[PDB]
Amino acid sequence: PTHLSVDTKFKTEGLCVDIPGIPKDMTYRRLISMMGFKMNYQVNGYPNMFITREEAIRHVRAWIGFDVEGCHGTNLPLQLGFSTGVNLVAVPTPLMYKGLPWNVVRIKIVQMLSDTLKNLSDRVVFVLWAHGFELTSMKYFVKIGPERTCCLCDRRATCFSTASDTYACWHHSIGFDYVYNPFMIDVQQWGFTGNLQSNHDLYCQVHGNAHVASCDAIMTRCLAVHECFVKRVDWTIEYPIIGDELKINAACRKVQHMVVKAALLADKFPVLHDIGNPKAIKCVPQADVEWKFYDAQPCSDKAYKIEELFYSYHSDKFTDGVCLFWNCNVDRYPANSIVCRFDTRVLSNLNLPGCDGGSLYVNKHAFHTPAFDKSAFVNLKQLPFFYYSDSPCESHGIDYVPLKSATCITRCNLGGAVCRHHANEYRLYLDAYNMMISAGFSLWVYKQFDTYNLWNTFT
Ligand SMILES: CN(CCO)c1ncc(Cl)cc1F
Ligand SMILES: [Zn+2]
Ligand SMILES: [Zn+2]
Ligand SMILES: [Zn+2]
């Protein structure tokens, strides 16, 4: 019990309007066969085209919604919709494309999945609300066989060329014409009542339905993400490194020690209220303050209501000292807050589109994050960039151009000439900070926060 058995049952009711007469008793084995594929009793690391929920969840970065609509079945033109927003029209002979045969349409499919997936995943998982035309259309652009490696690298193959009779991964697939060894999962096998739109719209206002293929494909992946990452949350599942995950996580630790350390030095709060992750530690262990912790798991669905977090009767006085919300998403921060809030709208490889304007940020773990709302920060201001150190000016061990910055808050710069050590640290910390910002995290602070207050911490 790791892979989906081909002898598992498949509920065919969803199928029976595109495919009138379909047996009620049906396995994956008979379905895969019906879709026109011979598995060839093969023990070569691809037991089933179809996969478990848990396998799909481990492979979320691979998810592409797929939907087909009878545009007028061998007879008639098909509309191919993907959760990239692409619509291709195949003939037998937002983006909407004109009617073209399978031999060109399949080239476009490889180009499309390869660009989308090459920096996310080693595979594709077509996410379905299966009614029949999507399953029967796959023979026109899919080939299955034993697991293979790229003809130019050691990445597993995801594409095949009939021109060259060779195999490529997503990176090396240019001019390839077939999707090789795809995975797929039918959402309609998870026990839903009524149609897609009805269930999607229970959870999501952001994706409308223009009655076109791409719209259903997006709605399908949305509902899938809702079920697997919003309503259900599995924080145990790890995920491969595919980008700057380790630099971003480190940057985030540095910035947090910096900002909170300086917040305490500037306004000398007697108590810090640390609201969020129950695993969180004192980011400034040295600081004078009463450090009080308050457990709140990352809300995946709707942002926490400050009313429900604080009131219902703690120092209880959360208006005493400062409230630290480090990736704790609430509706409206109090004015005495330091806030780190992930911006769901950022374009990166770590950040997958989500449900109801939210986003799925995958970095070691998967965290569905509520839609960024600018109105949450009305009592606060954007935190300005700055570097602060009280460490001795002293090189040790980093080639130089004399550092001039107003935002380098150090004994040296007060004395008008930044020492080389604090100039190395400064340009390191600025890089970290830039990393974190571009990665999508935003920083906000109580309005009275003024970096001018930090200079007098040397005298
Ligand atoms: C935001 N973030 C990284 C999420 O990818 C993070 N923030 C603070 C600490 Cl202490 C550690 C972290 F990893
Ligand atoms: Zn390759
Ligand atoms: Zn949606
Ligand atoms: Zn110095």
Q: Residue 179: CB within 6 Å of ligand 1?
A: no
Per DSSP bridges, beta strands 408-409 and 290-295 are unpaired
Distance (Å, whole) CA 59 – CA 49: 14
Alpha-carbon dihedral of residues 323, 328, 331, 332, nearest 10 degrees? 20
Is 275 annotated to bind a ligand? Reply is yes
Torsion of CA 410, 414, 415, 417, to 10 degrees: 60
Question: What's the CA gap between 96 and 300, in Å, rounded?
Answer: 33
CB atoms within 10 A of CB 163: 8
User: What is the number of residues in the chain?
Assistant: 459
The DSSP secondary-structure symbol of 228 reads: I
Q: How many CB atoms lie under 10 A from the CB of residue 322?
A: 23
Spatial contact of 325 and 276, defined as CB atoms under 8 Å apart: yes
Closest ligand 1 atom to 441 CA: 1
Task: Compute the Cα dihedral for 341, 345, 346, 348 and give only its sign.
Answer: positive
Tell whether residue 211 is among the known ligand binding residues: yes
> Rounded CA gap, 77 and 8, in Å?
32
Q: Long-range contacts of range 210-213, CB-CB < 8 Å, 24 or more positions apart? A: 212/69, 212/79, 212/81, 212/87, 212/96, 213/67, 213/68, 213/69, 213/79, 213/80, 213/81, 213/87
Whether residue 363 has its Cβ less than 6 Å from ligand 1: yes
Ligand 1 pocket check for 441: Cβ under 6 Å: yes
Both structure tokens of 395: 């090189």
CA of residue 217 to ligand 3 center, whole Å: 10
For residue 27, with 0-12 CB atoms within 10 Å meaning exposed, 13-18 middle and 19 or more buried, which class applies?
Answer: middle
Place of tokens 């998982």: 125
* 6: DSSP letter: T
Which chain residues have CB less than 5 Å from ligand 2, an ion? 150, 152-153, 155, 169, 171-172
In sequence order, what are the residues at sequence separation of 6 or more whose Cβ sits closer than 8 angstroms to the Cβ of residue 83?
Answer: 63, 64, 65, 66, 127, 214, 217, 218, 220, 221, 353
Is 153 annotated to bind a ligand? Reply is yes
Smallest CA separation from ligand 1 atom 3, residue: 249
Q: Report yes or no: 354 and 360 within 8 Å, Cβ to Cβ.
A: yes
Across 62-91, b (16+ Cβ under 10 Å) vs e yields bbbbbbbbebeeeeebbbbbbbbebbbbbe
Instruction: Tell me, in Å, the resolution of the deposited structure.
Output: 2.2
Indicate if ligand 1 lies below 6 Å from the C-beta of 351: no
- CB-based contacts of 47, cutoff 8 Å, min separation 6: 3, 4, 6
Tokens 């949450």 appear where? 376
Distance CA 102, CA 100 (A): 7
Give the C-alpha separation, 63 to 41, whole Å: 27
CA of 176 to the centre of ligand 2 (A): 12
Q: Which two tokens stand for residue 310?
A: 């604080």
Q: At 151, list the tokens.
A: 């003809």
| Helix (H) or strand (E) run with residue 67 in it | strand 63-70
Q: Nearest to residue 304, comparing CAs of 275, 281, 282, 279? A: 275
C-alpha angle 237-243-247 in degrees, rounded to nearest 5: 95
Residue nearest (by alpha carbon) to ligand 1 atom 9 = 253
Q: Are 245 and 350 in contact (CB under 8 A)?
A: yes
Helix (H, G, I), strand (E, B) or coil at 31: helix
Contact 27, 8 (CB under 8 A): yes
Q: Is 231 annotated as a binding residue?
A: no
* Cβ-count burial 205-241 (b if 16+ within 10 Å, e if not): eebeeeeebbbbbbbbbbbbbbbbbbeebeeeeebee
How far apart, in whole angstroms, are the C-alpha atoms of residue 386 and residue 291? 24
Residue 173 CB–ligand 1 contact under 6 Å = no
Q: What is the SS3 assignment for 319-343?
A: CCCEEEEECCCECCCCCCEEEEEEC
Identify how the structure was determined: X-ray
Residue 453 CA from chain centroid, whole number? 39
- Find out whether the beta carbon of 256 lies less than 6 Å from any atom of ligand 1: yes
Query: Do residues 271 and 290 lie in contact, with contact meaning Cβ atoms separated by under 8 Å?
Result: yes
3-class SS of residue 193? coil
Domain boundaries, the chain: 13-230, 245-457
Provide the 10 A C-beta neighbour count for residue 33: 13
Distance 247 CA to ligand 2 centre (A): 26
Ligand closest to Cα of 218 equals 3
Distance CA 281, CA 274 (A): 9
C-alpha 150 to ligand 2 mean position (Å): 4
- Alpha-carbon distance values, 347 to 127, 243, 360, 369, 434 (Å): 22, 13, 12, 14, 15
Whole-number Å distance between alpha carbons of 456 and 459: 6
Residues with active-site annotation = 67, 69, 134, 211, 216
| Residue 448 buriedness (CB in 10 A; 0-12 / 13-18 / 19+) | exposed
- Among all bound ligands, the one having the nearest atom to the CA of 411 is 4
CB 252 less than 6 A from any atom of ligand 1:
yes
Terminal-to-terminal C-alpha distance of the chain: 67
Ligand nearest to the CA of 215: 3
396 is in an annotated binding site: no
Q: CB of 259 within 8 A of CB of 443?
A: yes
C-alpha of residue 62 to centroid of ligand 2, in Å = 17
